[PDB]
């Protein structure tokens, strides 16, 4: 099977490979790969929100739950190391129902503003709600709401849409090298912010727009200008410096 996205796998030594089973099929992965990565090698696309391949593993969104043989609980595939002889099931009723329940929790307090949200049409939350949790909504109470924060002229903020995946916080501390974003508070009232008023001054700050899976962090100069489906994509390179 072709790896998801044509992802290349490099082996330090063939002896340092283990065997795992993904929905019956057999795959060979390097030692140290996680269950999610073994799924990618087997050409199985596991839904995920908090996991990013270039950031440290968080394991908080719980959308990557899969069924592992001899395991009493659904396993967070993004974090669990794959083991020899592991039998991984990704479409059994336990896995499908776990995804449905988590998706219902994600949409519980999410604002009804797809028409005014720039993420619409390229939103992971819309797609995974269509595919995995196709559950009619039964939440009728009052949603929570959050005030917006000022992060500067580049990053537009609508924090009602935030799903507390902490990708932006981890990017600020592991890639940008500037620790300004954090997660403040506790419980359902935790908020992503800088606490004190301050703007994102890192030269890599605009990348939080790409990594935010929802429309919480969006491009301010691009705001409301177009929908993704009407845009033509050209693959080129940058000439701002000598990096290409």
Closest CA to 116 of 234, 233, 227, 9: 227
Number of residues that bind ligand FES (CB under 6 A): 12
Q: How far apart are CA 182 and CA 168, in angstroms?
A: 8
Does the annotation place 123 within a ligand binding site? yes
Q: For residues 83-142, which are near other proteins according to CB under 8 A? A: 98, 101-102, 104-116, 119-127, 129-130, 134-139, 141-142
Helix 124-131 vs helix 93-106: angle between axes, to the nearest 10 degrees? Answer: 140
Q: How far apart are CA 122 and CA 136, in angstroms?
A: 22
Least distance (Å) from ligand SF4 to the CB of residue 115? Answer: 6
190 binds, among other proteins, ligand FES, ligand SF4, none (CB under 5 to 8 A by kind): other proteins
At 71, is the secondary structure helix, strand, or coil? coil
At 84, is the secondary structure helix, strand, or coil? coil
Q: For residues 32-51, which are near other proteins according to CB under 8 A? A: 32-34, 37, 40-41, 45, 47-48
Summarize as ranges the residues that interact with ligand SF4 (CB under 6 A): 110, 113-115, 117, 119-120, 123, 125-126, 161-168, 192, 211-212, 214-217
Q: How far apart are CA 215 and CA 205, in angstroms?
A: 16
Q: Which is nearer to ligand FES, 98 or 200 (CB)?
A: 98
Q: For residues 60-79, which are near ligand FES according to CB under 6 A? A: 60-64, 76, 78
90 binds, among ligand SF4, other proteins, ligand FES, none (CB under 5 to 8 A by kind): none
223 binds, among ligand FES, ligand SF4, other proteins, none (CB under 5 to 8 A by kind): other proteins
Residue 34 DSSP symbol: B
Among all chains, which residue has been given the structure tokens 């391949």? Answer: 53
Parallel, antiparallel or unpaired: strands 17-22 and 86-89: parallel
């Amino acid at each position: 099977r072709n790896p998801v996205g044509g992802a290349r796998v490099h082996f330090s030594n063939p002896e340092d490979a283990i065997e795992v089973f993904v929905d019956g099929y057999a795959v060979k992965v390097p030692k140290g790969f996680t269950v999610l990565q073994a799924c990618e090698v087997a050409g199985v696309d596991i839904p995920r929100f908090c996991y990013h391949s270039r950031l440290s593993i968080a394991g908080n969104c719980r959308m990557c739950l899969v069924e592992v043989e001899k395991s009493p609980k659904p396993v967070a595939s993004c974090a669990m190391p794959a083991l020899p002889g592991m039998k991984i099931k990704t479409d059994t009723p336990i896995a499908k129902k776990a995804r449905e329940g988590v998706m219902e929790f994600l949409l519980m307090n999410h604002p009804l503003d797809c028409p005014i949200c720039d993420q619409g049409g390229e939103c992971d939350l819309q797609d995974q709600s269509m595919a995995f949790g196709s559950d009619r909504g039964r939440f009728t109470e009052m949603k929570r709401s959050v005030v917006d924060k000022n992060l500067g002229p580049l990053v537009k903020t609508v924090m009602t849409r935030c799903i507390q995946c902490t990708r932006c916080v981890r990017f600020a501390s592991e890639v940008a090298g500037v620790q300004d974003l954090g997660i403040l508070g506790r419980g359902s009232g935790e908020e992503i912010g800088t606490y004190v008023e301050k703007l994102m001054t890192s030269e890599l700050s605009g990348n939080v727009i790409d990594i935010c899976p929802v429309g919480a962090l969006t491009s301010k100069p691009f705001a409301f200008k177009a929908r993704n489906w009407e845009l033509k994509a050209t693959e080129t390179i940058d000439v701002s410096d000598a990096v290409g």
